[PDB]
Write a protein that binds this ligand. Structure first.
Ligand SMILES: [Ca+2]
Length: 746
């Protein structure tokens, strides 16, 4: 309806710019079967971590008349690899949204990204940290039916200023291979009418996509018991050959045995060493528990019947056990979200054998509900599969089968957020964790994502860190099977988008008075020692403060341009903040678990300023990073060499959309088989990096189709689906990697 680029005049448009990519116009077979001229985009994404194109018109495009329309592209990958494109669309006010999808090799398809209308109209809950759509799904089922593919929602602004679209970017990021696509028919089409029922009847009685059939979908209890029987016949509890008791490499050489997991460089490559002295390399899955397997039903209970949290609890609500819902709570049950309730084709009555799989969450990070009833279809399917030989017996069977799977699949560990009931399994090592939470004073990065940042100079922060480590130690029982302890996860230490974002903690804290703010008192002390006189600081910051006492009221550095002196100061303050965080946490872990490795705080790509990484290097035995990319690119990881610290990937994943999910997750594959190929590529990258001692995949099970209760993530990121059935493509990929982790490294 509004053609932007059909490439038929045989010219590479001059308004299109190429980032580490070569462009040409070629003839290819289009979506309708007919040859057409398209833009061939050959990205040098093996060598370069950011590649692609950007369309940047002279003056921003005015598409304000398109009140319910989408941007369309015909795209296909050529060659050996699928391509995950990030589509970023920026308006004249600098507002941006990001969508992404996999582009398979094979037949060209049409892809669309909504600009306006439909599920963009009431876009979410409002909250800036709410990345979901209004439904409480990270991405929705499409709002109409067609052969076309909808770009998946990732993050950003749902309603751009259509009167000025300034830039359209398609990029390939942190790839392990050169990617090549053909793009054609960049256009705008008004949206079809919104299907009234697009959020209705999404889920069947097994928690599966009710509207779509796919390979492996369960259609009966018989089919489920059949899948169960086939798998159980193959699981015999036997570890891969040449594994030591603790999952290490029997062939050796054997190093000094200390009785606990430890680190050591073995001929130029960092390794773990198991309690008996065998070289070790950690592989396994995160979230080996049921806590995150429930989805909001849209019902609520009258609050007099809900137990409230204890202020001294060390476990945040998201990581609590599934809450046993009482008959009296359930009787008070009432509709709070019609939209949520209508998604479910079946939910059990109080008297049904599957009614124990209800959950209640008293808080949420984001989504349409702040609290509510939830249901775990996965847990219900465990009961369906394994039945009861005594009350709760399906949970014990799930734990036994889980360990048997891990051993068959060749994993050397259970990863982070393993339920403490596995801690005495004594057949496979595990990683422990705790969270430091409590009523201690806080600071802010100015863009805190999961939660506010702790004031690590408040004595109560240390009190709570000590209680946290105490509880973990009680769980661990000083077991040699515990590889190490993660504390906290993806803290907002400062984002890399800008220098002010990066130094958000110094900027925000400097803005506050010293009185009552321990971290501000610490920052004030450091700057007094640096500058001595307020006059030196005035000239460094270009200010005219009358005294240290005025300085200590709080200073709005946020409005000042970042200069050399301000940068040096923010760097110094960030370092001191991060040093104190890691000092206190390490001290607590060491106090209660003196034998065990402390594994850091799991840095994401949006939260690893170097000042904080160097702080972790000082105190953590092993520095942890979560890295959702296609692998570990040379340039992005070159800093590791100067630190010379053993490192671990706490999280990665790849998902697909061919098994009923509305959202593949953070990194996208073309199919379950392609998921398996991409897994192998990622792990090869880890195996090849001499600083890494392991990598854990997030997570064991798919997230619920309609979103995990905590924050609406609804991804295909499991080694098993909602019916507890393994993706065999992922099993095979894991076995291939796990059979060679040691021969490769050693
Ligand atoms: Ca064309």
């Amino acid at each position: 309806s509004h053609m932007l680029f059909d490439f038929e005049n045989d010219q590479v448009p001059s308004n299109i710019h190429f980032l580490n990519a070569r462009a040409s116009i070629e003839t290819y077979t289009g979506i309708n079967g007919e040859p057409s001229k398209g833009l061939k985009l050959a990205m040098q994404s093996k060598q370069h971590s950011y590649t692609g194109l950007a369309i940047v018109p002279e003056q921003p495009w005015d598409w304000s008349e398109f009140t319910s329309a989408s941007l369309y592209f015909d795209i296909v990958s050529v060659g050996d690899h699928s391509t995950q494109f990030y589509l970023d669309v920026t308006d004249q006010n600098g507002a941006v949204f990001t969508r992404s999808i996999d582009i398979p090799v094979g037949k060209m398809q049409s892809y669309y990204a909504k600009l306006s209308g439909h599920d963009l109209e009431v876009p979410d809950s409002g909250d800036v940290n709410d990345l979901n759509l209004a439904s409480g799904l990270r991405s929705n089922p499409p709002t109409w039916t067609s052969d076309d593919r909808q770009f998946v929602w990732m993050w950003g602004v749902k309603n751009l200023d259509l009167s000025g679209i300034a830039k359209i970017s398609l990029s390939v990021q942190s790839a392990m291979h050169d990617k090549t696509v053909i793009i054609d028919n960049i256009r705008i089409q008004p949206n079809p009418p919104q299907d009234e029922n697009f959020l209705v009847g999404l889920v069947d009685e097994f928690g599966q996509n009710a509207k779509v059939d796919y390979k492996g979908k369960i259609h009966s209890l018989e089919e489920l018991h059949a899948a169960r029987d086939v798998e159980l016949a193959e699981l015999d509890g036997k570890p891969m050959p040449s594994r030591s008791k603790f999952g290490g490499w029997l062939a050796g050489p054997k190093l000094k045995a200390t009785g606990y997991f430890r680190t050591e460089k073995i001929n130029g490559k960092w390794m773990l060493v198991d309690p008996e002295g065998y070289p070790y390399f950690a592989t396994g899955l995160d979230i080996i528990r049921l806590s995150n397997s429930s989805t909001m039903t849209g019902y609520d209970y009258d609050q007099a019947t809900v137990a409230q949290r204890s202020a001294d609890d060390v476990t945040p609500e998201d990581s609590k056990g599934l809450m046993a819902v009482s008959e009296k709570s359930f009787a008070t049950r009432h509709l709070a979200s019609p939209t949520r309730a209508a998604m479910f084709n079946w939910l059990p009555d109080y008297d049904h054998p599957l009614a124990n799989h209800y959950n209640y969450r008293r808080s949420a990070h984001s989504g349409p509900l702040k609290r509510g009833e939830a249901y775990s279809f996965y847990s219900a399917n465990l009961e369906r599969k394994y039945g009861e030989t005594y009350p709760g017996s399906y949970l014990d069977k799930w734990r036994e089968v889980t360990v048997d799977r891990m051993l068959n699949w060749g994993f050397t560990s259970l990863g982070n957020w393993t339920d403490p009931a596995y801690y005495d399994n004594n057949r496979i090592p595990f990683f422990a964790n705790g969270w430091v939470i409590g009523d201690f004073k806080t600071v802010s990065s100015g863009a805190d994502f999961w939660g506010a940042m702790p004031d690590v100079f408040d004595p109560e922060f240390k009190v709570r860190a000590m209680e946290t480590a105490r509880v973990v130690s009680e769980e661990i029982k000083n077991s040699p099977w515990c590889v190490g302890v993660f504390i906290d996860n993806e803290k907002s230490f400062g984002r890399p988008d800008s220098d002010k974002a990066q130094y958000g903690i110094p900027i925000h804290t400097l803005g506050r008075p010293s009185e009552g703010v321990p971290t501000r008192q610490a920052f004030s002390k450091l700057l007094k020692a640096k500058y001595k006189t307020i006059a030196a600081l005035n000239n460094a910051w270009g200010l005219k403060l009358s005294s240290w006492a005025e300085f200590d009221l709080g200073v709005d550095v946020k409005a000042l341009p970042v200069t050399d002196t301000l940068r040096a100061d923010y760097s110094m303050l960030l370092s001191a903040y991060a040093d104190q965080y890691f000092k206190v946490v390490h001290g607590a872990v060491e106090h209660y678990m003196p034998n065990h490795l402390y594994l850091g705080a799991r840095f994401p790509d949006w939260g690893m300023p170097m000042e904080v990484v160097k702080a972790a290097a000082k105190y953590a035995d092993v520095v942890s990073y979560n890295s959702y990319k296609e692998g570990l690119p040379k340039q992005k990881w070159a800093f590791l060499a100067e630190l010379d610290k053993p490192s671990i990937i706490g999280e990665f994943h790849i998902g697909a959309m061919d098994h009923g999910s509305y959202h593949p997750g953070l990194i996208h594959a073309a199919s379950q088989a392609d998921r398996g190929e991409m897994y192998k590529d990622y792990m090869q990258s880890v195996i090849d990096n001499p600083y890494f001692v392991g990598a854990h995949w997030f997570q064991y099970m798919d997230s619920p189709l309609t979103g995990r209760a905590y924050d609406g993530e609804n991804y295909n990121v499991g080694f098993v689906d909602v019916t507890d059935t393994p993706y065999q493509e992922m099993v095979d990929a894991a076995k291939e990697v796990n059979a060679k982790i040691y021969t490769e490294r050693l």
